[PDB]
Amino acid sequence: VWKDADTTLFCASDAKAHETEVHNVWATHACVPTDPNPQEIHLENVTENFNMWKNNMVEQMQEDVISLWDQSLQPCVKLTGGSVIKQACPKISFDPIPIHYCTPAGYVILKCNDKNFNGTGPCKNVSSVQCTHGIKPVVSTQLLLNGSLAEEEIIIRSENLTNNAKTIIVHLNKSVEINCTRPSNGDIRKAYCEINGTKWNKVLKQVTEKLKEHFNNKTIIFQPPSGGDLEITMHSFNCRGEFFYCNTTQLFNNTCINGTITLPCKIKQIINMWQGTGQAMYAPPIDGKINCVSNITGILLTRDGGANNTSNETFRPGGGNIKDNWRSELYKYKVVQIE
Ligand SMILES: Cc1nc([C@@H](NC(=O)C(=O)Nc2ccc(Cl)cc2)[C@@H]2CCCCN2)sc1CCO
Ligand SMILES: *[C@@H]1O[C@H](CO)[C@@H](O)[C@H](O)[C@H]1NC(C)=O
Ligand SMILES: *[C@@H]1O[C@H](CO)[C@@H](O)[C@H](O)[C@H]1NC(C)=O
Ligand SMILES: *[C@@H]1O[C@H](CO)[C@@H](O)[C@H](O)[C@H]1NC(C)=O
Ligand SMILES: *[C@@H]1O[C@H](CO)[C@@H](O)[C@H](O)[C@H]1NC(C)=O
Ligand SMILES: *[C@@H]1O[C@H](CO)[C@@H](O)[C@H](O)[C@H]1NC(C)=O
Ligand SMILES: *[C@@H]1O[C@H](CO)[C@@H](O)[C@H](O)[C@H]1NC(C)=O
Ligand SMILES: *[C@@H]1O[C@H](CO)[C@@H](O)[C@H](O)[C@H]1NC(C)=O
Ligand SMILES: *[C@@H]1O[C@H](CO)[C@@H](O)[C@H](O)[C@H]1NC(C)=O
Ligand SMILES: *[C@@H]1O[C@H](CO)[C@@H](O)[C@H](O)[C@H]1NC(C)=O
Ligand SMILES: *[C@@H]1O[C@H](CO)[C@@H](O)[C@H](O)[C@H]1NC(C)=O
Ligand SMILES: *[C@@H]1O[C@H](CO)[C@@H](O)[C@H](O)[C@H]1NC(C)=O
């Protein structure tokens, strides 16, 4: 017998003790080795309710990533609550590794295995595990990178689709690569991201059709963000320790619904911290070619309000709440107390 419960989780990883990469260093001191032969019990005739939007596992992972960034990514200058902190800001080795979240004795993790599970409601095909799958703490906005893919159809996730103030998580079932490079050999902060237009437009059209199913067959329109901070209006992410801000106007341009799409990007030293603190300034980019090839596995969308009396619904790429990023991977898990 069991019941829904919150408890202090621990983590597991395959981090290397000799590696200087900061995720490896953090996990070496904060996690245990993974289980090579993890047990999983599939529960027969069991119906369990899940709520990805109210899941303490998300808050706990958030706390890990914050602590990781606090120890690994201290800026030269920090601006918090009127205070000004000036510390050393050396260049680091940065590349996220998978992190497993696990329950202690007396508790287990219930895993929903329903193929098109949207994150809320009952789940039929439920299994029991001690640890989640390996989740890379990839911090980004607009586009979810290097995540897990949906098994069957593209999944739309929201705490309340009718509420346009609630973020929409689109879970892709097909990866689309994004190739971002700050070239080595005039503007050291100038960069770009290349994406195959054929793949992207094909996928975005599939997302369009899926959104129609959730919005009574209304016409789905994509538009670039209207306003706000650069972290939201642009696709922001971290590559090799460097913060990249990319213009995704070409990606959300309804007309193409075939060549290579080259997004204009820039490496920013001054950033609005995703931790919710204030602003921070980092050192200028390292020398040489800075390159990251990522899979786009999900999209964060915000729907416009005031469209009830029209046949259109307008969606714009958004984000900013990094907890939504962890939700996109933790949606199928919940902790129960074994009694
Ligand atoms: C105070 C606070 N501000 C937050 C803001 N979010 C961010 O600054 C942010 O994501 N920055 C960000 C994102 C990605 C990368 Cl690689 C680096 C920085 C929000 C986003 C939505 C609109 C307003 N800005 S998140 C947060 C607290 C969250 O608990
Ligand atoms: C659950 O499992 C059944 C039988 O294996 C399978 O046919 C079905 O796709 C699953 N149902 C759901 C709700 O995902
Ligand atoms: C998800 O599925 C549940 C039923 O399991 C349903 O009540 C809810 O409306 C769905 N949410 C979305 C985002 O479609
Ligand atoms: C990128 O996606 C591909 C194809 O879906 C997958 O094989 C690979 O593991 C992914 N790479 C990551 C997660 O870095
Ligand atoms: C992805 O999901 C869509 C439905 O959302 C489906 O039509 C398509 O076949 C899926 N693609 C793959 C490769 O499974
Ligand atoms: C979803 O949001 C809409 C608009 O804010 C609201 O009218 C509705 O009551 C919400 N649904 C729930 C279950 O709270
Ligand atoms: C990424 O783009 C760069 C610059 O065009 C190119 O040299 C490189 O081959 C690309 N990488 C991959 C794996 O496609
Ligand atoms: C349009 O979407 C509705 C659901 O909103 C669906 O019932 C209908 O089958 C779709 N269009 C067609 C093929 O009539
Ligand atoms: C993105 O690029 C377009 C021009 O292609 C420009 O008009 C727009 O202002 C850019 N977006 C941002 C947020 O810089
Ligand atoms: C969006 O599509 C239109 C097609 O009319 C094109 O002219 C425009 O350049 C596109 N936006 C881009 C690629 O920045
Ligand atoms: C995208 O991939 C398709 C294969 O589906 C290929 O034909 C095309 O060369 C690629 N487009 C670009 C310009 O990257
Ligand atoms: C995604 O995964 C690839 C392969 O490990 C990595 O090279 C790339 O830097 C990752 N992207 C991000 C944004 O971390």
Automatic annotation (TrEMBL):
It comes from Human immunodeficiency virus type 1. Inhibitors targeting HIV-1 viral envelope proteins are used as antiretroviral drugs. Attachment of virions to the cell surface via non-specific interactions and CD4 binding can be blocked by inhibitors that include cyanovirin-N, cyclotriazadisulfonamide analogs, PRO 2000, TNX 355 and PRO 542. In addition, BMS 806 can block CD4-induced conformational changes. Env interactions with the coreceptor molecules can be targeted by CCR5 antagonists including SCH-D, maraviroc (UK 427857) and aplaviroc (GW 873140), and the CXCR4 antagonist AMD 070. HIV-1 lineages are divided in three main groups, M (for Major), O (for Outlier), and N (for New, or Non-M, Non-O). The vast majority of strains found worldwide belong to the group M. Group O seems to be endemic to and largely confined to Cameroon and neighboring countries in West Central Africa, where these viruses represent a small minority of HIV-1 strains. The group N is represented by a limited number of isolates from Cameroonian persons. The group M is further subdivided in 9 clades or subtypes (A to D, F to H, J and K). One of its GO terms (biological process) is positive regulation of plasma membrane raft polarization. Disulfide bonds join C11-C31, C76-C89, C102-C131, C112-C123, C180-C193, C193-C246, C193-C265, C239-C292, C246-C265. It is found in: Host cell membrane; Host endosome membrane; Virion membrane. The keyword Signal applies. Residues 1-339 form the Human immunodeficiency virus 1 envelope glycoprotein Gp120 domain. This is Envelope glycoprotein gp160. Palmitoylation of the transmembrane protein and of Env polyprotein (prior to its proteolytic cleavage) is essential for their association with host cell membrane lipid rafts. Palmitoylation is therefore required for envelope trafficking to classical lipid rafts, but not for viral replication. Residues 225-235 are annotated as: CD4-binding loop. The mature envelope protein (Env) consists of a homotrimer of non-covalently associated gp120-gp41 heterodimers. The resulting complex protrudes from the virus surface as a spike. There seems to be as few as 10 spikes on the average virion. Surface protein gp120 interacts with host CD4, CCR5 and CXCR4. Gp120 also interacts with the C-type lectins CD209/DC-SIGN and CLEC4M/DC-SIGNR (collectively referred to as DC-SIGN(R)). Gp120 and gp41 interact with GalCer. Transmembrane protein gp41: Acts as a class I viral fusion protein. Under the current model, the protein has at least 3 conformational states: pre-fusion native state, pre-hairpin intermediate state, and post-fusion hairpin state. During fusion of viral and target intracellular membranes, the coiled coil regions (heptad repeats) assume a trimer-of-hairpins structure, positioning the fusion peptide in close proximity to the C-terminal region of the ectodomain. The formation of this structure appears to drive apposition and subsequent fusion of viral and target cell membranes. GO terms for molecular function: structural molecule activity. The chain holds residues 43 to 486 of 857 of the full protein. Keywords: Apoptosis, Clathrin-mediated endocytosis of virus by host, Cleavage on pair of basic residues, Coiled coil, Disulfide bond, Fusion of virus membrane with host endosomal membrane, Fusion of virus membrane with host membrane, Glycoprotein, Host cell membrane, Host endosome, Host membrane, Host-virus interaction, Lipoprotein, Membrane, Palmitate, Signal, Transmembrane, Transmembrane helix, Viral attachment to host cell, Viral envelope protein, Viral immunoevasion, Viral penetration into host cytoplasm, Virion, Virus endocytosis by host, Virus entry into host cell. Residues 308-318 are annotated as: V5. The gene is env. One of its GO terms (cellular component) is membrane. Some of the most genetically diverse regions of the viral genome are present in Env. They are called variable regions 1 through 5 (V1 through V5). Coreceptor usage of gp120 is determined mainly by the primary structure of the third variable region (V3) in the outer domain of gp120. The sequence of V3 determines which coreceptor, CCR5 and/or CXCR4 (corresponding to R5/macrophage, X4/T cell and R5X4/T cell and macrophage tropism), is used to trigger the fusion potential of the Env complex, and hence which cells the virus can infect. Binding to CCR5 involves a region adjacent in addition to V3. The YXXL motif is involved in determining the exact site of viral release at the surface of infected mononuclear cells and promotes endocytosis. YXXL and di-leucine endocytosis motifs interact directly or indirectly with the clathrin adapter complexes, opperate independently, and their activities are not additive.
